[PDB]
Amino acid sequence: MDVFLMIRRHKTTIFTDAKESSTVFELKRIVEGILKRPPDEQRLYKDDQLLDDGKTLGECGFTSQTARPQAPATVGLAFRADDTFEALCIEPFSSPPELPDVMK
Amino acid sequence: VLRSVNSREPSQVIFCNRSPRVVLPVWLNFDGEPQPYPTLPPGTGRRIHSYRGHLWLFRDAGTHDGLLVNQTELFVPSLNVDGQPIFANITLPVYTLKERCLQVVRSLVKPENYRRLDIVRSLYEDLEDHPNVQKDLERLTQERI
Amino acid sequence: MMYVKLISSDGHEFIVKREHALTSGTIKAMLSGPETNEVNFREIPSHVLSKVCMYFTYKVRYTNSSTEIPEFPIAPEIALELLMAANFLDC
Numbered sequence: 001m002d003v004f005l006m007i008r009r010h011k012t013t014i015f016t017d018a019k020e021s022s023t024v025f026e027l028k029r030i031v032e033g034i035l036k037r038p039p040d041e042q043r044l045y046k047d048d049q050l051l052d053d054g055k056t057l058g059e060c061g062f063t064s065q066t067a068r069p070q071a072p073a074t075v076g077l078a079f080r081a082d083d084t085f086e087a088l089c090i091e092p093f094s095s096p097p098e099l100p101d102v103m104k
Numbered sequence: 105v106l107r108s109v110n111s112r113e114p115s116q117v118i119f120c121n122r123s124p125r126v127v128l129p130v131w132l133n134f135d136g137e138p139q140p141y142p143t144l145p146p147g148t149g150r151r152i153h154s155y156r157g158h159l160w161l162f163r164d165a166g167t168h169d170g171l172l173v174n175q176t177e178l179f180v181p182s183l184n185v186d187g188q189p190i191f192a193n194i195t196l197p198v199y200t201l202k203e204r205c206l207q208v209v210r211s212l213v214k215p216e217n218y219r220r221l222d223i224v225r226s227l228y229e230d231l232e233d234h235p236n237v238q239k240d241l242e243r244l245t246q247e248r249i
Numbered sequence: 250m251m252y253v254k255l256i257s258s259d260g261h262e263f264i265v266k267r268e269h270a271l272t273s274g275t276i277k278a279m280l281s282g283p284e285t286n287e288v289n290f291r292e293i294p295s296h297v298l299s300k301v302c303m304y305f306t307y308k309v310r311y312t313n314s315s316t317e318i319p320e321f322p323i324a325p326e327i328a329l330e331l332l333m334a335a336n337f338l339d340c
């Protein structure tokens with residue numbers, strides 16, 4: 001089972017997939033290959049929860065049922081600039097307009 | 105061009121609706137006229153009694169959106185090996201994003217008000233051009249030419 | 250693999266597999282003619298461009314597969330902007 005993810009930090013969102021059986025650390029290797037930052041400089045989150053490097057994605061609650069291509073599950077990412085990391089900040093997307101009269 | 109062959113060879117089929125739509129099976133008769141058959145609720149199946157060389161296609165019963173059967177447009181019952189019925193798997197296609205948007209907008213806006221949406225004229229016509237089996241049959245006919 | 254950066258009108262940066270992004274012929278043209286792997290969309294806000302990237306993933310996964318295909322979900326509040334975006338992107 002592939003799971004489909006959005007790795008999000010500030011205004012950056014990475015679309016990627018991984019095996020449910022792969023670990024958080026292996027996912028950290030994917031983002032460093034993309035965003036050029038080592039795992040020990042990365043923190044991955046599910047909601048407000050820090051994930052252990054050794055845990056599988058499925059153990060962290062990323063399953064095919066909840067991480068679908070058309071509806072990926074969100075991973076928070078925070079970087080260690082020099083020390084104490086930073087607090088997780090995932091910027092939300094823009095707001096849709098009010099439904100036009102003819103659709104409401 | 106597109107018509108069922110009068111093979112007179114019975115062929116048993118399972119119409120399996122692996123879609124979330126209510127499915128309308130449509131038989132192309134010996135003259136090429138589309139014949140609608142009873143609908144299938146989402147996820148249900150029917151063992152239909154058919155014939156070799158007959159032509160079937162499948163649609164959303166409410167909107168006439170196109171559907172796939174065994175990964176293609178048309179289903180032709182084949183020979184039943186050891187009496188085993190032929191499986192017909194009806195699925196959603198991968199719609200284009202544009203067509204998928206047209207479906208959702210069509211489902212939310214009465215046709216009188218398409219013109220009241222703030223969109224380019226060409227999209228009005230795109231919205232207004234509701235799926236219809238006969239135009240698809242005409243297109244498919246040229247596809248052969 | 251290779252990735253590209255897709256930037257919405259409000260400045261959100263979406264990084265997608267190059268192969269996924271090349272689903273859109275419009276984007277294919279933005280990469281080969283008129284930062285080498287970035288495209289800015291002055292007209293597509295982040296709540297639309299995010300759904301488009303989800304569409305690319307969905308299309309690549311389920312095209313030519315024998316797995317039962319799920320509906321691509323579109324919230325009514327974004328259907329109108331997604332329609333114009335999809336039309337522009339030819340996908």
Ligand SMILES: Cc1cc([C@H](C(=O)N2C[C@H](O)C[C@H]2C2=NO[C@](C)(c3ccc(-c4scnc4C)cc3)N2)C(C)C)on1
Pocket residue numbers: 110112119129131141142143144150152153154155158
């Ligand atoms: C000989 C010969 C006979 C024929 C022709 C004929 O008999 N046909 C045409 C197609 O091959 C289907 C078959 C047929 N028509 O009615 C049944 C009994 C039928 C009833 C319901 C459902 C469905 S589909 C969804 N729900 C149900 C229950 C499916 C099939 N079988 C014509 C006489 C119409 O062509 N050659």
